[PDB]
Design a binder for these strands. Structure first.
Ligand SMILES: Nc1ncnc2c1ncn2[C@@H]1O[C@H](COP(=O)(O)OP(=O)(O)O)[C@@H](O)[C@H]1O
Ligand SMILES: [Mg+2]
Ligand SMILES: [Mg+2]
Ligand SMILES: [Mg+2]
Lengths: 48, 313, 309, 312, 312, 312, 312, 50
DNA sequence: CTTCCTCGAAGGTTC
DNA sequence: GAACCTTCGAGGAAG
């Protein structure tokens, strides 16, 4: 899952989030098994 | 009504209202969202309410935000996930959005997806996120500074206009029913004539006349009370304040119509240059009473016949 | 105290004073707060004074700040959090607020709530009914959206000789100086129509009477004191009289340019245009023309010369 | 995509299209890169489309960027290093990049190499990097806006221009089939005449006319239907937009044709002065409706009769 | 010392000096601070010198600063609150203070309080800071540059005037005793009449004469040495410089007295238009040698009888 | 390469070459640098090329930049610190250099030193920089636009002029020999007559004609082919560009031949004033197409008989 | 070296040298610094050179800076802190300083102190800096731009005159001795008459003639080589350029001596209206070739014999 | 030494010293020249796209 | 965003 | 009616 976890954190940074905040935002997500799309979708949704 | 649910209730703006009705119905005959729409016009005419009515006609949920509130690409992308299929997104002051976000909106508007690029060299990759269909409704005052690529995405243009006397009269009538006061139809017309075609100014006059009618009268706004109230206030039958009348009189009486410089005119009426150039002068140009020339302001024939003075070329 | 406390003490301004009484009375009768009021006009006419009078008539405590003291949105957010129902907020020199602060202020005026971002965090506030009172000399410097939010506009005007005469007599009682009815009129004529100038002349005359007289202002001491200050019966200063004289005796009344006149009197160009001419033009002693400025018939009669068209 | 892929499909621009054919094939005979080319002209005429056609005819993969996308020399040098012999680089709005970048583009275009000077104080050295042969394509809205020494490097100029009625009718007719719309040869001509020479204006009008025909008619765009729809869209028979009609009407009724200054006119109609002079006056000047004088704008006799007012 | 310290030593300015004596004496009988004083007028007439005299006669400490030094409200807020009851604050070149800073004095001068923002974040507070009674004194050469609300707050206005020959003679004789030199009464009058009415110029001429008298003479100033020293400096008995004489001569010998334009005359003397209009022309007009008219400059009869020509 | 490298290869400019030979040769017997040289004249005549020739004759390195590229004084100081003794510095477009920057050259050119403020805060200090001997070469179109302080410091002035048919014809023959191409004498003469007397244009046209002759011809340039090729392009039978045609076609129709000001004309043709003022007006004036008048420019009879109008 | 170092070497400016000698000697006897002095006049007459002579005669370390180098008050304060007792501070182009900084010198020149704001901002206060005795020397080309309060503080004013042929001839000889070239008195007088009275121009012509005389001569500047060299430079025996010669001739050949207006003549010479008035007309009037009149300008008899026409 | 040369070249192009070092430090080839390194340090940092 | 200043228009005199 | 001179007003660009 580290592959998708690293992708989701890196993609979220590309959206203008700081490297620190992106790592925390993704770490707050529960499901590890879901793909980066679901992880990035939930990260943005939870921060709204 | 003041809070309209459908075009049948929205007062005025008949041109833009008639066009949107046909486009919405044509879109409904298909399982498609309405084309991206851009609204133009001076500030204060009611663009925000117009967007709300469009959503009720389509039978859709409306999301509301503004250009300044969006600072990074992630802000916009997060909002787009909140949309259900067919939702309407309204962005005010769209010309103030930073370019870093503007370039992301192009792909979303045209394809309904966003592609995010990450990595470098041999590790370069992209992730693709689908978006549900949506209609972006933009509103702006300064249409002339939008980039050409952005203007090319919008498919419908609507122009708002100042209200006319037959419609601005109805806003006064309807507003008079929110308070508890009776107003004669002949009096409602007198307030509309002086409201400069703007609903905000019509409300202000009604409030000031209301206070007078319940302290200097029997609590009813008849033509006799309106005449007195509009006499305590300086506003003339054309909507000119006291200071507006003093400017026109001075130009005709002391300079013979001009040309006269801004500084020379300011010291005669005892006002700051900024006050005459921004508060009073803009409306006199729209009304056609003065012109600005390389050598100074000049009064027009329309101004002479309104103040009641003889005119000669 | 020098500043009037109630409308019964506020001499003059019958137009603004009459309108404010109607709007204040109607608001009380409905138990509502007063609409937002903007006060503007020339210096020294009574704008700051009227702000305190409004509060004393409404029976509320006035919160006071100034434009130059507000530098960031966080400052205004702190101030507004202290308001209670019916409070009146007065902002002097409102034209100095930064553009980023104006956008916050005019939102609260319409919807009575604030929703702003301030390591960044959001701030949200719900505001009780309140009245904002602004005073400024440069109303045209305010943004068009903000000016539209104000519901009352008060434009101040210059005073008349009967009104200024009463002010001079009133202030004389605070200094407990005795002054005669005809002597008070001599200070009114020279006060250029402004209360602050009337108070200034009274102070300078009082100081003379305490040293060169018997400590009483009378028709004879006033004439001597005004001769020392060298203020003409029309209020013209020594330099103002020198301008008209030079125009009539060296250029036959004009036209003459601003540069030529300034160099001939040994004065700076910017001082003549911005400090001395404005009063001469409003009283009708000088005219501006496409080719220069000329002295009017009123100037010839006052200086004592034979007019020639 | 709607845009064509080859010169056989590309409608109009016969002059530019004929010249580029000769210059492209001549380069093949010598087996060398095509000379640097500059495309200029009004917006929406097909400049971006043409850039892809050139690459397809040459048989190369196009690389694309824009003026505001490049901000430091390292950006351009990185892009230039990732090139293959014969690659074509397209830079839109070439006139907007910073001059600090132009200093490097000169030697890249003319010398095919760069020499990075490095050192501090008394020290100074340089390293030269070889660049594979490439062809630069630039595009702008005006020719003179481009930096004078940079303009001298472009060896081929391509002046784009407005389409004529035959070419626009062929475009209008084609696009209608994509929407599954039935349009007669007469109706397609009315829309063409009023699109004022711009292909995307014609396409935008067609999409809007379709909606009206599907409701106020039987789904067939007839001459009788198109004329009613175009008056509903408030588009004049000369292609004057809503704002264009407002300008002329105000000059005639409120100022007797002028002269009038831009400040007065831009304040009477609620518009920004930067909008009037940039978006609308250019068309009214070329079409001869308004003329510029030191005293202000004036409405010509043609404008008077078109709007329908008794001339002096 | 070179600057007087009390009204007994301050020669001239009778009008301004008379007023200040009455107001200062009255303020002492009431035991209260003096009202705010603004001093303005031409350069070198005694504005700064009078500011020190006021403090010495009031018998209080003088705090000094200047307009160019203050740049932000924080600087002024630090000068304030350092004041003690009865202190005098003197600001020189007050016209340089930024407009955003002058608006801080509006409350201080009228009500002796200012509004300050204090604390941080949620603890931010607006508090009244209250000042003891004090007297502001300002000196400026450009009074018309101050905002109208500020000039209205000053309670005493002093406008300086040029000095007469009797007063300047006494000033020369006084200064001649600070240095160690004997000067004949008839020689001091000769320097005073050439000093254009300004004390600083009278001191400058004396300093230049001293250098000559001790190098080319016996160390004493007498009519014979003064005439020689004044011949080296080439200053006319009316104070006209070398270039001032050249202007009048050219106007009388080439243009017959005028009218002549500023440009035509400048080129004939090899000067430049800005030097003639700002350095030389002002004194010639104020002394009646030249008259400005719509057609050009004209030389008056007074100039003819001075240069020795015939007023034909 | 095309660009000449020695005076024996530089065609024309006989009046300038003769002077530069003597000064360069005299500067070689003595061990010193060449005096600062200013080159001015119409664009495209070969003044940048002349700078390379000078450097090659002197045998030193050449550094190149432009006025508009230098934004602040610190930029020029960094550049001057990068020159070794005897190097040549070439600055193009020097008339648009900012005033704040030009003020630095006055001391550098006369004495090779600069007064600069270095450090910040408490570390701020004045330093007296010293520069090695160097020769500045400046190029400008508007010699009369330079300030009197700068123009007086250049020691050599070179005026450059349009090339005549015997010179341009030789340049075409030379260029057509670097490429492996063959041109007949009649074709080279006609191609020069069409080239506005400007080498930059003659070289650009020759390349395009060569492409046409290779694909649409027999690989050899003949008068018949050159006439056809130059007719496929917009080059008129006497070198008028399409812009030249629009100017002449406008003056006669919109203004009845004039007189008309160049300012209003520029905005009516949608062109930048500088381009028409510096690149087009000089040629049309020196060739009798446009003539100057107090009220403005007027079209001559030669223009009417060229565009086919009647000189009524 | 080229620049003189002592009064014994400085030719001309007798009026200024005579005065400066007395004031320097008197200052030494008193053991005091020299009064502040302002040097002004036309360009290239020796102002910058004279400032160094003063320092050598006083015998002190000259500290140098420039007007445009001082960007803000912080820079000027740093410079003043470095002064030692008796140091001379020289500021060339003193008119380029900003007004906000020029007003800081007012206190430094009269009272030798500066008011400075110090402290972190939480705690801050004004303090008096006390400067040692020093001499300020200023040089400017246009004193009319300095504010009246600044010009009044300078105690010694020096106005530079143009040089006469006797004095200017000695400068040409002296300069040849440095180049080791032999020059005959007959030729030195020819160079002087063409130097327009300016030393900078005389040195420039001598350099160009020296180069020519050694490349195609015997290494002697004889009366014949000088004339040949000057013929190549195109300098008339009165110093007129070809542009000036065209003007004087045109007035005679097309207008019979005038009167003609400036706008009419400008067209006949293809010269910009303001250039002719600012660049070329001044010297022609000062030499007496042209005369201004109420109806235009007229070519005098002197201009007739110089061109050889028949005066009538 | 070519590492510092490569870093010095990348500094001139506007890259900060930290990134230029990090960029160049990612590359390693003892026989590479500063010129061949430069052409790799940039190629390794540009995002290739298809 | 602001202060200075330069470029242009036109009124009036005279030949 | 061609040429000089003075005066005012609105932009724009350098802080
Ligand atoms: N058709 C209308 N009917 C009733 N009130 C209106 C109408 N149009 C505008 N108004 C009033 O004028 C104001 C419009 O504000 P808003 O809709 O925010 O303007 P905009 O969105 O154009 O900035 C509101 O006070 C609104 O009640
Ligand atoms: Mg107040
Ligand atoms: Mg002083
Ligand atoms: Mg010098």
């Amino acid at each position: 899952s580290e592959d998708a976890e690293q992708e989701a954190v890196a993609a979220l940074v590309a959206l203008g989030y700081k490297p620190q905040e992106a790592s925390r935002m993704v770490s707050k997500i529960a499901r590890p098994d879901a793909s980066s799309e679901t992880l990035i979708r939930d990260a943005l949704r939870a921060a709204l | 009504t003041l809070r309209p649910q459908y075009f049948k209730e929205y007062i005025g703006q008949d041109k833009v209202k008639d066009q949107l009705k046909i486009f919405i119905e044509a879109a409904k005959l298909r399982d498609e969202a309405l084309d991206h729409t851009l609204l133009f016009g001076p500030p204060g005419l009611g663009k925000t309410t117009m967007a709300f009515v469009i959503a009720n006609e389509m039978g859709v949920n409306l999301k509301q935000t503004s250009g300044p509130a969006i600072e990074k690409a992630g802000d916009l992308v997060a909002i787009l996930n909140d949309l259900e299929p067919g939702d309407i997104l309204f962005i005010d002051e769209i010309h103030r959005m930073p370019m870093a976000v503007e370039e992301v909106l192009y792909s979303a508007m045209e394809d309904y997806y966003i592609d995010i690029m990450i990595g470098a060299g041999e590790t370069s990759r992209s992730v693709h996120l689908d978006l549900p269909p949506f209609t972006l409704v933009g509103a702006t005052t300064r249409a002339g500074m939008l980039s050409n690529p952005l203007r090319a995405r919008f498919g419908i243009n609507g122009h708002m206009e100042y209200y006319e006397l037959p419609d601005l009269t109805e806003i006064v009538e309807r507003t008079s029913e929110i308070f508890e006061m009776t107003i004669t139809p002949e009096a409602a017309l007198e307030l509309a004539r002086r409201s400069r075609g703007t609903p905000r100014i019509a409300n202000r006059l009604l409030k000031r006349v209301r206070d007078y009618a319940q302290i200097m009268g029997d609590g009813v706004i008849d033509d006799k009370i309106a005449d007195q109230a509009l006499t305590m206030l300086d506003v003339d039958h054309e909507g000119l304040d006291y200071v507006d009348q003093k400017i026109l009189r001075t130009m005709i009486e002391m300079y013979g119509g001009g040309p006269v410089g801004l500084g020379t005119l300011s010291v005669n009426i005892a006002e700051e240059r900024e006050t005459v150039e921004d508060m009073y002068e803009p409306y006199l140009i729209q009304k056609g009473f003065i012109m600005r020339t390389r050598t100074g302001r000049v009064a027009t024939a329309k101004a002479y016949e309104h103040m009641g003075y003889d005119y000669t070329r």
